[PDB]
Structure 1
Amino acid sequence: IRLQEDPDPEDENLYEKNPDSHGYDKDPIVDLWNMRVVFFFGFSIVLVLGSTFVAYLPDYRMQEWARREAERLVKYREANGLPLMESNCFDPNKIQLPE
Structure 2
Amino acid sequence: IRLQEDPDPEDENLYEKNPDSHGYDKDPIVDLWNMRVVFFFGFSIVLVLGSTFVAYLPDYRMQEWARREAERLVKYREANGLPLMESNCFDPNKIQLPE
**TM-score for the superposition, normalised by structure 1:** 1.00
Taking the aligned partners of 1:4 and 1:57, their CA distance within structure 2 comes to 64
- The RMSD of aligned alpha carbons is 0.1
Q: Tell me how far 1:78 sits from its aligned partner.
A: 0.1
Q: Tell me how far 1:84 sits from its aligned partner.
A: 0.1
- Residue 95 (structure 1) aligns with: 95
Deviations 1:4-44 (A, max 9, x none): 00000000000000000000000000000000000000000
Q: Tell me how far 1:98 sits from its aligned partner.
A: 0.1
Unaligned runs of 5+ in 1: none
1:12 partner SS: coil
Q: Tell me how far 1:47 sits from its aligned partner.
A: 0.1
Unaligned runs of 5+ in 2: none
Q: Does 1:64 align with 2:67?
A: no
Q: How many residues align?
A: 99
Taking the aligned partners of 1:12 and 1:21, their CA distance within structure 2 comes to 13
